[PDB]
RNA sequence: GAUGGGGAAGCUCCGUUUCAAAGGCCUGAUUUUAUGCAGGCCACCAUCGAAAGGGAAUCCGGUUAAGAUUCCGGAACCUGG
RNA sequence: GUUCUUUGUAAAGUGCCUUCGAAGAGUCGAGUUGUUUGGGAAUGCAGCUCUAAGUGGGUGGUUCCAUCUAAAGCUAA
RNA sequence: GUUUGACCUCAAAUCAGGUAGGAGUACCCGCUGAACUUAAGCAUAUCAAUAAGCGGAGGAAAAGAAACCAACCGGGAUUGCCUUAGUAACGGCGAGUGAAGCGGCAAAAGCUCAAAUUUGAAAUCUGGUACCUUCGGUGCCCGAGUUGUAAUUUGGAGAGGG
């Protein structure tokens, strides 16, 4: 072409790159673990295979458990903020348990929690501190 | 005959045969290796086809109606992040292919391990 | 002799709309709350300016320094919004509507006064939008309405109620006719 | 001359020296004329333009240190990578979620698995 | 809220009141240039259920075009909607609706939504049309007048024109030759 | 070059008249003057009347032009529109 | 030939004052509910277009390898400050 | 993989009971002109006369029946 | 109040901060649009919904989550290839033109607004300024917005409550 011609009849030099070896080499990044027992040599069937996971969820086109168990075995293996800290407390001394008073109560429960969001809070302040 | 045009103006040789199933497989490898935990396609139902000629032949499906996901101990919302596709505008009428996708739908589940969020 | 376009188009439109015959939809403005009972309200309504951004923003400031260290009802205010205006009526809770006759787009405010007097809601037309956004702390808002009020000024807003049914919404019911535009 | 000499020289000592590569090429250039060739001249006009360059940087980091951390920097000094990436709006830009698809994201996250067992 | 009744009466566009609106709208544009800023929209409604906002950055103009046709082939608020682009390089057209016509002229109203502005940018439900592959949406026919002209659709009823007539005839007419002939 | 005009070098570019003076700063005569008292500027006398006004005989009055083009300057005139805005 | 406009999908065509907010001069003690500006006058409106059109001004002598109202000597005239 | 911050009577997800529950207009459509499509069942497009309804409307098939419900917008392979 | 300001509309700055022309063009999206050639010389027709000409983008573009296809045991975004099929169908029914359902496969991701009052608080944001853990964050200031900026949601419904 005519731009291609002045990049070889200059000596500006050509930005060469090389990157097709890496396009079918490409290093599994996604799990350590499978990256400890995947294997380049073999396709992404081949390995799914070897690992014990099945490479496709569909009938695959045309013709055709340690590792598990450690992946597995390693799939196996909240607080209360001051200020209503401060008002569960002092629901608790005002009324105590008594939800059917509390529930009422326009100078404690400001916004009107309901009976049975009352009663969670008290048993969550309560477990938090016997 | 169908060349009184400049047929010759277009003329798309498929050279790139040889070439496209490589990419194909390249890119399914490229997949796989940012996929590898989960595989390369979501769990497609079984449905059953239109057009008689065609019927007596049972095919896969796009995705699970909400009544199938509902049937399978789970939600539309979220069993899409495990990889089962949902169709919100398919309805179910045949009570046999529900009773297909529902088993599959378990099977599914019995067979999957969810990585913990840690 | 020559004048600026703008000025000429403006007042060729002003000279058209009091030469042109409108349906009684139209001009069912012109006529507007007196010059004494709107001062009246605007009395009462100058007692509700809603909270500034300013204002605000000091309260909310003394607030959180007092909390840092370690109940009031509602603050009754006047509502301007045209979609809750709208949302107000249809639904009752609205007690005094204003309208500005000096809408840009006639449309936004034709079915306003009807649509108040059709659920029953009593409403006043006043002159100038500018009035109502001088008291809103907006340049205009083209409505106002009033919701749940001081105890005191209840029977002040009940007065007004009376002297605008009486003044305009009585008086002025025989808009309907008269097609407006008329003057020679 | 050399241009690591003359960094840590102060800048009035560039400017007197920038005269002085003047004068000697003037010099050289009327000497040349009445000769077939000077091989100096290349030398002194090469040390002219290494001083200017010289001088330019210093100014021109000092502007930049004028500027420093304040936002609009003088177009000069700004990114020339190419008119079409001061478009394509930035990380930030680009990143911003609306508050649904966030919730929704926090909500459903894109969860990791495998079907063997 | 008002949004509602305001649709309802815009339908109603031989109404009365609709009437003298647009007789004297009709004088006060013709008045006017023939494109012209609006400094708020004449149909709210019609504007917000179109995706137009009242933040800054977005620009409501009023364009006039002449009607008519031996025979032409575009619409006309394809041809405004160009025109309108063709003036405020720096905005990008969303879509427009119509707010009056007359005799020798039809008026459209056409939204239009600076991508420069920061606050079209910071803002995730619109910062989407800052991506070049947007500019000149109305030069290319991808408006909604444009779609609606072009013919794309779903159906039997679009089969020529679903995908573009060109775009399905050239991939139509086209002598496919595999290398292993069938 | 060409031919010079009479009445554009010299005293009639060397001072400026007080009306010039004014429409050249955009600033009011009330300003205008507030800042000359504050900078002490006064007016002066050329030896010849009629060169330094464009060859016009007239009563005017006559300022030192490098005097006001400094006064452009004062921050006093910008604070002058920042305290008109403020009113 | 822009300028303010109209037609044309458009590369663009019309139009030179065309119903444009199209600039250029002066004065005052600093403008009185107190230091934010008042008043007086004219209504045309870019540019290019001529080395044969109008124009501000140099005459003589001598000099060179090629230049002279220009280079050298003498004496001249126009514009501005 | 290591570490700082959360916190706020804050933000979410499912089941049950209860009270409500919102549908884009000069747009569909009709008659006509010109063009195009295999698209006669007038395929769509642009102009022109008129103009629409909300248990309403498009398209097709046995006396009704099946699907969406447009006239706003974004999207990787 | 023979006054002042609110507004609404319209102007100006070599104003602070910005953007647009143009080039390239095989492919993409539209506008515009002929003829040579061919059939019973050429009236419909083929060349052609092509070349030329014009405008608009990217590395891909467009389209894309149904006012879709089907009539069945229903399919279930768009795109691309084989088949469908040189078939249905058009064609002064003469030359020629010519699809689409479904089926086989490469890939999959769905969604966001309008229309519901935040009304117990426009809770939203552009811009200037002083700092910093500077693709942006904090305080202050001015302004845009009530002719609507925040939050939830939209046929898979959804929303207020226990």
Redesign the pocket.
């Known amino acids: 072409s005519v731009r291609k011609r002045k990049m070889n009849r200059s000596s500006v030099g050509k930005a060469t790159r090389r990157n097709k070896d890496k396009q079918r080499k490409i290093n599994i990044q996604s799990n350590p673990i499978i990256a400890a027992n995947w294997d380049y040599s073999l396709t992404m069937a081949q390995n799914y295979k070897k690992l014990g996971l099945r490479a496709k969820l569909q009938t695959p086109?045309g013709g055709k458990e340690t590792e598990v168990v450690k992946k597995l075995e390693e799939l196996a293996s909240?607080?209360?903020?001051?200020?209503?800290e401060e008002?569960l407390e002092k629901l608790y001394k005002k009324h105590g348990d008594d939800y059917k008073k509390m529930f009422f109560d326009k100078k404690l429960?400001?916004?009107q929690?309901?009976?049975?969001?009352l009663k969670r809070?008290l048993l969550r302040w309560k477990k938090r501190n016997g | 005959?169908?060349?009184?045009?400049?047929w010759q103006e277009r003329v798309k040789v498929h050279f790139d045969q040889a070439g496209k199933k490589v990419s194909?497989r390249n890119?399914?490898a490229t997949?796989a290796a940012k996929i590898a935990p989960r595989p390369?396609?979501?769990l497609?139902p079984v449905?059953?086809?239109?057009?008689?000629?065609?019927?007596?032949?049972v095919?896969?499906?796009?995705?699970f109606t909400?009544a199938e996901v509902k049937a399978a101990g789970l939600?539309?919302?979220?069993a899409?992040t495990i990889g089962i596709?949902?169709?919100?505008?398919?309805?179910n009428?045949?009570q046999?292919?529900f009773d297909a996708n529902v088993q599959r739908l378990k099977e599914y589940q019995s067979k999957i391990i969810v990585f913990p969020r840690n | 002799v020559?004048?600026?376009?703008?000025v000429r188009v403006?007042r060729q439109k002003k000279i058209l709309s009091i030469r042109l015959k409108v349906p009684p939809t139209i001009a069912q403005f012109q006529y507007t709350l007196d010059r004494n009972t709107a001062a009246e309200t605007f009395k009462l309504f100058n007692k509700y300016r809603?909270?500034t951004?300013?204002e605000?923003?000091e309260?909310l400031?003394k607030e959180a320094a007092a909390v840092a260290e370690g109940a009031?009802?509602?603050?009754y205010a006047v509502?301007?919004?045209?979609?809750?205006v709208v949302?107000?009526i249809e639904?009752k809770?609205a007690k005094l509507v204003l309208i500005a006759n000096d809408?840009?787009?006639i449309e936004?405010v034709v079915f306003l006064p009807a649509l108040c007097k059709k659920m029953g809601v009593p409403y006043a037309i006043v002159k100038?939008?500018?009035?109502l956004?001088?008291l809103?702390?907006?340049?205009?808002?083209?409505?106002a309405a009033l919701?749940?009020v001081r105890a005191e000024d209840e029977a002040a807003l009940a007065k007004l109620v009376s002297t605008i049914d009486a003044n305009f919404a009585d008086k002025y019911d025989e808009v309907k006719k008269h097609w407006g535009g008329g003057i020679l | 001359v050399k241009a690591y000499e003359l960094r840590t020289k102060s800048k009035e000592q560039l400017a007197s020296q920038l005269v002085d590569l003047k004068k000697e090429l003037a010099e050289l250039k009327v000497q040349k004329l009445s000769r077939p060739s000077l091989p100096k001249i290349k030398t002194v006009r090469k040390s002219i333009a290494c001083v200017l360059t010289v001088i330019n940087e210093q100014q021109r980091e000092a502007v930049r240190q004028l500027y420093?951390?304040?936002?609009?920097q003088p177009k000069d000094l700004r990114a020339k990578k190419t008119r079409?990436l001061?478009?394509a709006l930035?990380?930030?830009?680009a990143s911003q979620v609306?508050?649904?698809?966030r919730?929704?994201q926090?909500?459903f996250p894109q969860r990791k698995y495998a079907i063997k067992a | 809220?008002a949004?509602?009744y305001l649709?309802e009466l815009?339908?109603?566009?031989?109404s009365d009141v609709l009437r003298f609106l647009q007789r004297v709208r009709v004088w006060e544009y013709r008045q006017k240039?023939?494109?012209?800023?609006?400094?708020?929209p004449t149909?709210?409604?019609?504007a917000?259920?179109?995706?137009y906002?009242?933040?800054?950055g977005f620009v409501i103009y009023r364009v006039?075009?002449?009607?008519?046709?031996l025979?032409?082939?575009?619409?006309?608020?394809a041809?405004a909607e160009?025109?309108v682009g063709?003036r405020a390089?720096?905005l990008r057209v969303?879509?427009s609706?119509?707010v009056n016509?007359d005799?020798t002229?039809?008026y459209f109203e056409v939204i239009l939504v600076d991508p420069?502005?920061?606050?079209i940018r910071?803002?995730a439900?619109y910062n989407?049309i800052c991506?070049?592959?947007?500019?000149?949406?109305e030069?290319?026919?991808?408006?909604?007048?444009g779609?609606?002209?072009?013919?794309?659709?779903?159906?039997?009823?679009?089969?020529?024109?679903?995908?573009?007539?060109?775009?399905?005839?050239?991939?139509?007419?086209?002598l496919?030759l595999?290398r292993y002939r069938? | 070059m060409?031919?010079?005009?009479?009445?554009t070098?010299?005293?009639?570019r060397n001072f400026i008249?007080?009306?010039?003076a004014?429409?050249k700063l955009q600033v009011?005569?009330?300003?205008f003057?507030?800042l000359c008292?504050f900078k002490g500027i006064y007016p002066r006398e050329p030896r010849n009347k009629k060169?330094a006004n464009?060859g016009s005989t007239?009563?005017?009055?006559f300022y030192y032009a490098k005097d006001i083009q400094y006064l452009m300057h004062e921050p006093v005139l910008a604070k002058?529109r920042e305290?008109?805005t403020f009113?």
């Open positions: 086109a909240r607080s209360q903020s001051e200020r209503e008002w429960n400001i916004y929690q309901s009976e049975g969001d809070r | 005959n169908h060349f009184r045009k400049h194909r890119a399914r997949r390369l396609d979501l497609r449905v059953r086809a239109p057009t008689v000629k065609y019927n007596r032949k095919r896969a499906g796009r995705g909400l939600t539309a919302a979220y899409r596709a949902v169709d919100h505008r398919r309805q009428r045949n046999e292919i | 020559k004048w600026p376009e703008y403006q809603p909270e951004a300013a605000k923003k309260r400031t009031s009802p509602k603050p509502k301007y919004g045209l979609n809750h949302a107000l639904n809770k809408v840009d787009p936004l100038g939008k500018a009035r956004g001088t809103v702390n907006q340049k205009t808002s083209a409505v919701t749940e | 420093k951390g304040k936002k609009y079409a001061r478009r930035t990380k930030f830009e609306t508050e649904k698809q919730k929704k926090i909500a | 809220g949004y509602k649709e815009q339908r109603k566009k031989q240039n023939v494109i012209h800023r609006a400094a708020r149909r709210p409604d019609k917000r259920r179109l995706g906002k009242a933040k800054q006039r075009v002449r009607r008519g046709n025979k032409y082939q575009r619409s006309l608020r041809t160009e025109r063709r390089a720096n969303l879509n609706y119509w016509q005799s002229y039809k420069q502005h920061k606050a910071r803002d439900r989407w991506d070049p592959v947007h500019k000149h949406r030069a290319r026919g991808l408006t909604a007048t779609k609606k002209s072009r013919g794309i659709n779903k159906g039997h009823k679009f089969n020529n024109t679903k995908a573009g007539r060109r775009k399905t005839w050239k991939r139509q007419n086209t496919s595999w069938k | 060409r031919i010079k005009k009479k009445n070098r010299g005293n009639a008249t007080r009306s010039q004014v429409r009011s005569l009330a300003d003057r507030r008292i060169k464009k007239a009563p005017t009055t002058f305290h008109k009113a």
